[PDB]
Design a binder for this molecule. Structure first.
Ligand SMILES: *C(=O)c1c(COP(=O)(O)O)cnc(C)c1O
Ligand SMILES: *C(=O)c1c(COP(=O)(O)O)cnc(C)c1O
Lengths: 336, 335
C-alpha cells in the first residue's frame, strides 16, 4: 500500500513556524543503474517544502531572528542584502512577519520573477542599471551602506554565522529521520552555510559522516581552479566564502553545468520530484558517490535546495533528452 | 518564543507519500480589523505545501491510486484528462511515480509554462487546435476515447467520486489540527471536490459545521446566475459540476475577481503567505464570515488551494496598493 502524510497535529502561529521539518525521500528511478548496489540507500532532503520553497527560508529567518534577539536589529532599522536569488526571498518572508523593512539590491534586469515575489512581500527593491550587471549592484549596495551606517542591518549571507546556525535544524532533521544511519551528506555550495552547518552538526553526533561539497566544474574554486562562468543557479559564487571551512569537507565533487541540468530533468521524469538546477548537481554527485565500491550499503543524504518551478523561465525543461532512462543514466554515471 | 517546524521522523518511500498533511496556520495581519472580534480564530490550510504545490496533488493521486486498486486502471492502459491547470500537474506527478502514461489534452494556445511542467513529468501532451480553444480540446479528448475505448482511463475531474474522496484526509487533518473546534469551512469551488468532500466529512464528526462555497461574482453559477468572464484562476468553471451537492453547502459567497486579487496581495504583504488567486477569494469570504455577529469566537478554516508563484506571469501582482493595511482592509470589508 501507499501511506500519504498524516496530520501535523499543530496550529502554527504564523508562516515562519512552518519553516523546516522538510521531508527526506528515497530515490528509486534514477538509482536504477548497475553502478549502484541495491542495498545502498540514496535519500533526498526536499527544501522545496519550506513555505517559500527553498533552503533560504531557514537562512533568512535565522539571520533576522538572531539579529533581533541579539539587539543587532532594532525598531527603526532596515535589513539590506545584495541578492538576485533565494536569499532575497527568505529575507523578505521573515522581514514581512517580523515587521522590518527589507531592502534588496539587484540589477534591474535580473530574475524579474524573483523581483515580483520580493516586491509582493513588501520589499524595497533597489534596482541598479541593468547594463552594469552585478558589479553595478555591488557598487550600489556599498554606496547605500556608507550612506546609512546605523540604519541598515546587512544580512551578509556569505559570512553570517546565523546562516550556518540555521542548519542545526536541518542536521537534526537528518539525524532523527535516518535514526542516526546517515553516512554521507552531499550539499552543493553557494554560501556554504548548508555544507558547513549540516556537516559540523552531523559530525558532532557521528564522527565518521563523510561531507561532500559540490560545485560547478566550470567554476571549481573550492578545488583551487579559477572562477569562470557557469549555469548552475544558486551555487558557484566564484570565491571561497567566509563561511566555508575546508577542514569540515571530506570531498569536493565538481559537476558540469549541462550534467546538472540533465540530471534534474531525469529526476523529475523518473522519480517525479521537480527539483532545481543545484539539486540536479547535488543528485548527480550523490549518485556518483553511490557508485563507489567503499560506499556499498551506506545511507547517502542529498540536499535539494529548491524546486524546478522556479526555473521555468530557463530552458531547463525546454531541452529534451531523446534517449531512454538507461541511455540517460549511462551517459551520466558510466565512468567511461 | 518562535517554535519552527519539528522533524517528520519518517523516510518517505516516494514523493507521493509526502502528499497531504498540510499546515494549518493562524492569520493575524489581515484579521486586524474592527469588524472581526479578537476571540474569533481564522486559520488557513496551506495546500501549497503539497509536493507540486496545489490541492490537486491529492486529487490526481487518489484518482489514479483508487483506479489501480479497483482494477479500472490496468497495466497497458493510459490516463487521460482535459485540463490546463493544477489537475494536470497532480495527475502527471502520480502517473510518473505509479509508472503509467499520462495524456493531457489542452489547446496549443496555452503558454509553454503550463505545458512545460507537465511534459517535464513525462506526460504526453495532446495539443488540440489552438484556434478552437477549450471546446477543441474536449472534441479531441472525446475522439480519442471513442476510437480507443479500452486504452484510456478518464480522470473525469468534475465528476469522479475519487476526487471528493481524497478530502477524507483533508477533513481529518482539519479535524485533528483543530481538536474538533472547527466551526466553519470556506472553500472556493472548482471541481467542488474540496467543498463537498471536506464539508461532508467534517459534518459527520460535527453536524453544526457551516460549509461556505466561494465562486467568482462575475460567474456565480452556483447561485443560479449566468456564466461570465472572470479572472480567479482555479475556480469558476462556469457550470455546476457533477460533484456539487447543494445540500452540503450552507452559504455561497460571491467574490469579485479584483477583490480576490487585492486580498491575495494583502495576505502576502501582511501575513507573509504567498497564496494564489482562488486563495484570495476564499480568504476574503472567510474574513467577511469572521465579521458576522453570530460568528464571534468561532474557528473559521479556509482552504488555500495553491501559491501565488504559479501566477507570476499574470497581472496578480501588477497593481500596487498605495494605502495602508487599514485602508486596504476597509476597502474590502466595510460597506
Ligand atoms: C543557497 O541559497 C542555495 C544553494 C546553496 O546553499 P548554501 O548557500 O551553500 O547553504 C544551492 N541552491 C540554491 C537554489 C540555493 O538557493
Ligand atoms: C482545484 O483544482 C482548485 C480549486 C478548487 O478546488 P476544487 O476543485 O473545488 O476541490 C481552487 N483553486 C485552485 C488553484 C485549484 O487548482
Amino acid at each position: 500500500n501507499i501511506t500519504i502524510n498524516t496530520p501535523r497535529k499543530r496550529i502554527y502561529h504564523n508562516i515562519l513556524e512552518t519553516i523546516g521539518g522538510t521531508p527526506l525521500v528515497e530515490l528509486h528511478g534514477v538509482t536504477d543503474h548497475p553502478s549502484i548496489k541495491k542495498n545502498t540507500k540514496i535519500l533526498v532532503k526536499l527544501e522545496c517544502f519550506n513555505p517559500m520553497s527553498s533552503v533560504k527560508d531557514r537562512v533568512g529567518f535565522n539571520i533576522i531572528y538572531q539579529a533581533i534577539k541579539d539587539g543587532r536589529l532594532k525598531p527603526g532599522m532596515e535589513i539590506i542584502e545584495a541578492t538576485s536569488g533565494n536569499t532575497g526571498i527568505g529575507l523578505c518572508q521573515a522581514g514581512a512577519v517580523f515587521g522590518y523593512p527589507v531592502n534588496i539590491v539587484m540589477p534591474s534586469t535580473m530574475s524579474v520573477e524573483r523581483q515580483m515575489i520580493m516586491k509582493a512581500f513588501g520589499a524595497n527593491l533597489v534596482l541598479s542599471d541593468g547594463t552594469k550587471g552585478m558589479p553595478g549592484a555591488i557598487a550600489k549596495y556599498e554606496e547605500l551602506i556608507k550612506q546609512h551606517p546605523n540604519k541598515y542591518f546587512p544580512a551578509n549571507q556569505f559570512g553570517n554565522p546565523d546562516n550556518t546556525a540555521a542548519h542545526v535544524y536541518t542536521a537534526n532533521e537528518i539525524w532523527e529521520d535516518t535514526n542516526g544511519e546517515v553516512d554521507i551528506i552531499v550539499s552543493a555550495v553557494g554560501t556554504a552555510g548548508t555544507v558547513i552547518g549540516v556537516g559540523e552538526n552531523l559530525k558532532k553526533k557521528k564522527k565518521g559522516v563523510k561531507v561532500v561539497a559540490v560545485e560547478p566544474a566550470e567554476s571549481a574554486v573550492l578545488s583551487g581552479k579559477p572562477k569562470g562562468p557557469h549555469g548552475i543557479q544558486g551555487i558557484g559564487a566564484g570565491f571561497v566564502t567566509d563561511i566555508y571551512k575546508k577542514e569540515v569537507v571530506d570531498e569536493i565533487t565538481p559537476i558540469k553545468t549541462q550534467d546538472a541540468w540533465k540530471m534534474a530533468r531525469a529526476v523529475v521524469k523518473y522519480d517525479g520530484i521537480m527539483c532545481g538546477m543545484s539539486s540536479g548537481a547535488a543528485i548527480l554527485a550523490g549518485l556518483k558517490e553511490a557508485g563507489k565500491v567503499e560506499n556499498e550499503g551506506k545511507t547517502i543524504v542529498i540536499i535539494l535546495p529548491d524546486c524546478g518551478e522556479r526555473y521555468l523561465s530557463t530552458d531547463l525543461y525546454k531541452t529534451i533528452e531523446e534517449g531512454t532512462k538507461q541511455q540517460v543514466l549511462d551517459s551520466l554515471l558510466l565512468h567511461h
